[PDB]
Amino acid sequence: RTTRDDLINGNSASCRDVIFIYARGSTETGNLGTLGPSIASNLESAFGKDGVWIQGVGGAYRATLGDDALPRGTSSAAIREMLGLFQQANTKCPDATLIAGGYSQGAALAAASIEDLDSAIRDKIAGTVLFGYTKNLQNRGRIPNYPADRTKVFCNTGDLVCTGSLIVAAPHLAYGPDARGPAPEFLIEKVRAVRGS
């Protein structure tokens, strides 16, 4: 449940049409944490197990407490890891539509990764969802170099990380409903749209 490596494990001759790369929050377990499994099960309901590959950002990304305070909201090692996953998706499954997401430090990680990504690969990311986005105020609610229409930010009233702090308050732990409903519906609608005509 909390650890999914579908992209790394996936048989390349049977690539999924959709690949979801997700980064967990600070101190969370597995490579999906608390919110990722909810999003994943909904994506699976839409595209089936063979239609979407769920890949959590593991490896060098330890979701360490304190790394939140680094300049980009996470470590260089973590950014390298996620950029590496995007690159692997691009080469292993060139025809796949990518979708991404992150929560807490993971949201900062997703934003930094997408900002640094090669433009050809970045164009393949149909949609990105961010929960308790730690760089929300700093980046004015956007992911640098990425269009607003493909971004959905979930920042609760009272979630201090959305207003420039790093402190964890009650509203920061209340994104479960968003992960089970609006977030996957957004991602699915974006995929359906780009791969449709």
Swiss-Prot record:
SUPFAM superfamilies: alpha/beta-Hydrolases. It is found in: Secreted. It comes from Fusarium vanettenii (Neocosmospora pisi). Catalyzes the hydrolysis of complex carboxylic polyesters found in the cell wall of plants. Degrades cutin, a macromolecule that forms the structure of the plant cuticle. Allows pathogenic fungi to penetrate through the cuticular barrier into the host plant during the initial stage of fungal infection. Inhibited by n-undecyl phosphonate (C11Y4). Inhibited by paraoxon. It comes from the Eukaryota. It catalyses: cutin + H2O = cutin monomers. The lineage of its organism: Eukaryota, Fungi, Dikarya, Ascomycota, Pezizomycotina. The 2 disulfide bonds play a critical role in holding the catalytic residues in juxta-position; reduction of the disulfide bridges results in the complete inactivation of the enzyme. This is Cutinase 1. One of its GO terms (molecular function) is cutinase activity. Disulfide bonds join C15-C93, C155-C162. Keywords: Disulfide bond, Glycoprotein, Hydrolase, Secreted, Serine esterase, Signal, Virulence. One of its GO terms (biological process) is carbohydrate catabolic process.
